[PDB]
Amino acid sequence: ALNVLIYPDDHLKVVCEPVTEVNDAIRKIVDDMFDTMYQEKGIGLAAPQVDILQRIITIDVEGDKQNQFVLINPEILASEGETGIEEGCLSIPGFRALVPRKEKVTVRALDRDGKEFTLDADGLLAICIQHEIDHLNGILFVDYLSPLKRQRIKEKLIKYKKQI
Amino acid sequence: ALNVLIYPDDHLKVVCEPVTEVNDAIRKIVDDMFDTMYQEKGIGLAAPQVDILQRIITIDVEGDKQNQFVLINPEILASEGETGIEEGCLSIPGFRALVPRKEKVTVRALDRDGKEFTLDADGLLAICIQHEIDHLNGILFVDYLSPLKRQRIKEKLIKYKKQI
Amino acid sequence: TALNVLIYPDDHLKVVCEPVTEVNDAIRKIVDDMFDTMYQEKGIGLAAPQVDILQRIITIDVEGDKQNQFVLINPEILASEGETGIEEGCLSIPGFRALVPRKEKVTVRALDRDGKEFTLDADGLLAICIQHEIDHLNGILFVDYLSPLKRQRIKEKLIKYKKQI
Amino acid sequence: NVLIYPDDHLKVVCEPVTEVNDAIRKIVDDMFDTMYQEKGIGLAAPQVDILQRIITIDVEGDKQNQFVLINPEILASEGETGIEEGCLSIPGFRALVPRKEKVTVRALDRDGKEFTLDADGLLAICIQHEIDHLNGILFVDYLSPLKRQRIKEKLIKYKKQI
Ligand SMILES: CCCCC[C@H](CC(=O)NO)C(=O)N[C@H](C(=O)N1CCC[C@H]1CO)C(C)C
Ligand SMILES: CCCCC[C@H](CC(=O)NO)C(=O)N[C@H](C(=O)N1CCC[C@H]1CO)C(C)C
Ligand SMILES: CCCCC[C@H](CC(=O)NO)C(=O)N[C@H](C(=O)N1CCC[C@H]1CO)C(C)C
Ligand SMILES: CCCCC[C@H](CC(=O)NO)C(=O)N[C@H](C(=O)N1CCC[C@H]1CO)C(C)C
Ligand code: NI
Ligand code: NI
Ligand code: NI
Ligand code: NI
Structure with a gap:
């Protein structure tokens, strides 16, 4: 466990600093993220969701330490296609939204050893x-979403956060 | 007489939402932005720098108010060439650095009456x-900038903000 | 006594300064005061008459980080080439800029902070x-x-400004 | 009244004249009068504490070939030459000044033409x-810095003396 920030929260809206150097401290953040992610049944986790304002992403789609991706300072270089599934978020618990995404993506990034x-x-x-x-x-x-829909989500999650 | 955010600040690192409606309130914000820009002797200013997280820009290169530019929900249509000048920012006071830029640009945006x-x-x-x-x-x-230079500027400004 | 600057209009902003006879420590103290004034006011350059010293002294730091401070005492341009322009501002003329026709490259000889x-x-x-x-x-x-008109307009705003500050 | 070196107004870059009006033409005439009274062949407004671009010359001394230059500017100039130049604002001193021998000058005259x-x-x-x-x-x-200094100091002491 690290603490997962719930919306609304400023650190969920911040554009994160790139990792300067993928070292031991970073790799512990990566392992701690994987832990939290699995504990929460996430298939991905981004650093700011646990209040670390750096460009670090852990992913495991199939969710069994199979195809574990680490994406540090990632950039989409190319994309194509159109798609969109109903998406939920650990930082927005209890909600879903159809999000238009690119079907196919080609990404550059540093792995956990900095390569x-x-x-x-x-x-x-x-x-x-x-x-x-x-x-x-x-x-x-x-x-x-519409500013109105998003607002209504926000109000509800505020309630849930005092409640928890 | 709105205050300018000083780096580091979370809200200087926020992707701002489109203005949905160019109304009298947006116009008031515009006028307040110009006032601050003039007071602070800047030639440009973005809404987040006065802590308003919307896609509103005010520019006046000469500063005599003859050629004011209001850019609401701007999009660069196209750009080419290269330049750079040691750039300063009101939100990063005392520091300037060369930034790789396009030399020429074509933007679309909404003006002060949403045209x-x-x-x-x-x-x-x-x-x-x-x-x-x-x-x-x-x-x-x-x-x-290199994270190293970025870090120095960050450190020296946290110091300065404490003094304020 | 504060790290302040003469504001246009003022006579001493139109005075032709005399060469420093010797770079002693009244002069090095003027140099350090100028840098502090430049940095206080977030400027990139400064000239001595802007802090009311009628001497040929200039301090420049484009980046602000002190990593590349230039000091130029009794400067002269040996040569220059080409032309360029950018809407220039001045701490002595706050809130205004104008494109001024300049040489693009310049070769300057001058004395440093030590007199060398x-x-x-x-x-x-x-x-x-x-x-x-x-x-x-x-x-x-x-x-x-600029044109008499543009300048007169600037003067008028600036008197008003000087009062209010 | 002619200013005596040192004085900050003898170092001020003067403002252009915007209208050659009557205030200016009185200045010009007051300047010739002062120039002749003091035995000069040239005078510049700041020498009489008027920070505008106005020049009154008479080399002859006879009010015959009087030149008036308002907002002058040099367009061309060739050759080198020199003379022991004096100045009504710097009484009791001369210096050999390297000058251009020939000069081309555009200015407004006494009636702004x-x-x-x-x-x-x-x-x-x-x-x-x-x-x-x-x-x-x-x-x-x-001049060399020390020589300038020397003259400035004598004239400071000369200035008190009256
Ligand atoms: C779809 C794009 C990736 C979603 C990533 C999130 C994790 C997260 O909040 N990352 O920022 C997740 O695992 N969300 C889960 C989720 O929505 N899941 C889990 C299995 C399938 C998928 C359904 O969208 C929740 C509801 C447990
Ligand atoms: C430089 C390109 C435009 C930068 C805009 C900034 C204002 C700002 O903070 N915008 O977000 C500005 O006015 N910058 C000025 C500035 O530093 N300038 C002015 C000319 C170019 C640049 C420094 O070379 C400051 C000191 C008031
Ligand atoms: C750049 C030409 C040298 C001017 C340097 C001045 C400082 C000054 O008054 N020097 O006499 C400055 O820092 N000017 C800034 C400025 O306006 N700049 C920065 C770069 C060009 C110009 C405006 O575009 C101000 C607003 C902080
Ligand atoms: C030639 C350069 C113009 C100098 C004219 C000066 C008048 C002056 O003060 N001009 O700014 C003059 O006549 N000065 C007299 C003088 O000494 N002479 C003799 C004629 C001109 C000057 C020598 O250049 C006085 C002091 C007696
Ligand atoms: Ni998420
Ligand atoms: Ni900025
Ligand atoms: Ni200046
Ligand atoms: Ni003279």
């Missing part, structure tokens, strides 16, 4: 990558 | 437009 | 600052390249 | 001297 890599993804991986990168730029799925 | 316009710009104007639209995506000139 | 002679090639902003500050040493401001 | 003049010899020299004044430059500024 650059480039990855082509589609389907769920591609969507999860995009959901996670929005996080790094302080964008949530609610940001694709 | 669409297109503007072609070069020279300083073009540079300011890019810098100000960068603020709207939660990007500052120090984010183009 | 250097030569500097400069382009870009640096070269524009050098020229702008040398103009100050010769009782010339950016408003003097 | 534009004219352009080629000049040589003494005229040319005074024109340069007198434009220097409008740009805050005195003949002593062509």
Whole structure:
């Protein structure tokens, strides 16, 4: 466990600093993220969701330490296609939204040992990558809703946070 | 007489929401922005720098108010060339650095009464437009610098903010 | 006594300054005061008559981080080339800028903070600052390249401003 | 009244005249009068504490070939030459000043009409001297720092003496 920030929260809206150096401290943040992610049954997690304002993403679609991706200072280089599934967020518990995404994405990033890599993804991986990168730029799925819908979500989550 | 946010500040790193409605309130904000820009002797200003997280930019290169530019929900249509000047920012006081920029730019935006316009710009104007639209995506000139230089500026400004 | 600056209009902003006879420590103290004034007011260049010292002294730091402080005492342009322009501002003329026709590259000889002679090639902003500050040493401001009308308008705003501050 | 070096107004770059009106023409006439009373062949407004670009020259001394230069500017100039130049604002001193021998100068006359003049010899020299004044430059500024200092100090003590 680290603490998962719930919307609304300023650090869920912040564009994160790139990692300067992928070292031991960073790799502990990565392992701690994986833990929290699995504990919460997430298929991805972005650093700011646990109050760390750095560009670090952990992903595991199938959720069994199989295809574990670490994406540090990631950038989408190319994309194509159109898709959109109903997305939920650990930082926005209890809500879903159809989010228009690119079907296919090609991404560059540093792995947990600091080595650059480039990855082509589609389907769920591609969507999860995009959901996670929005996080790094302080964008949530609610940001694709109407200001009115988003507001109503917000009010409800405020309640849930005093309640918890 | 609105106050300018000083780096580091979470709200200087926020992607701002589109203005949905260019109404009297947005116009009041515009006039307040110009006042602050003039008071603080800037040539441009983005709404987040006065802590208003919407896509509103005010520019006046000469400062005599003859050629005021209001850019609401701006989008760069196209750009080319290269330049850079050691750029300063009211939100990063005392520091300047060369930023790689396009030399010439064409933006579309809404004016003060919500009428669409297109503007072609070069020279300083073009540079300011890019810098100000960068603020709207939660990007500052120090984010183009080495993390080392960015860090020094951050440290020296946290000091200065305490003094204030 | 505060790190303040003469504001246009003022006679001493149009005075032609005399060469420093010797770079002693009244002068080095003027240099350090100028830098502090530049930094206080978030400027990139300064000339001595802007803090009311009628001497040929200029301090420049384009980046603000002190990593590249230039000091130029009794400067002279050996040569220059090309032309350029950027809407220039001045701490002595707050809230205004105007494009001023400048040389793009410039070669300047001057004395450093210790009194030792250097030569500097400069382009870009640096070269524009050098020229702008040398103009100050010769009782010339950016408003003097404008039209009587534009300048008179600026003067009028600035009197008003000076009062209110 | 003629200012005596040192004085900040003898170092001030003067403002252009915007209208050649009657205030200006009185200035011009008051300047010739002062120039002749004090035995000069050239005078510049700041020498009489008027910070505007106005020059009054008479090399002859006879009110015959009087030149008036308002908002002058040099367009061309060739050759080198020199003379032991004095200045009514710097009484009791002269210095050899390297000048252009020939000068081309465009200015407004006494009634604000534009004219352009080629000049040589003494005229040319005074024109340069007198434009220097409008740009805050005195003949002593062509001297070594210590020599300038020396004269400034004597004239400071001379100034008190009256
Ligand atoms: C779809 C794009 C990736 C979503 C990532 C999120 C984790 C998160 O909030 N990242 O910022 C998640 O796992 N959400 C879960 C989720 O929505 N899941 C889990 C299995 C399938 C998928 C349904 O969208 C929740 C509801 C447990
Ligand atoms: C430089 C491109 C435009 C930057 C805009 C800034 C104002 C700002 O903080 N905008 O977000 C500005 O006015 N900058 C000034 C500035 O530093 N300038 C003015 C000319 C270019 C640049 C420094 O070279 C400051 C000191 C008032
Ligand atoms: C750049 C030419 C040299 C001017 C330097 C001045 C400081 C000054 O008054 N020097 O005499 C400055 O810092 N000017 C700034 C300024 O306006 N700049 C920065 C770069 C160009 C110009 C405006 O575009 C101000 C507003 C802080
Ligand atoms: C030639 C340069 C113009 C100098 C004219 C000066 C008058 C002056 O003060 N001009 O600014 C003059 O006549 N000065 C006299 C003088 O000494 N002479 C003799 C004629 C001109 C000058 C020598 O240049 C006085 C002091 C007696
Ligand atoms: Ni999420
Ligand atoms: Ni800025
Ligand atoms: Ni200046
Ligand atoms: Ni004279």
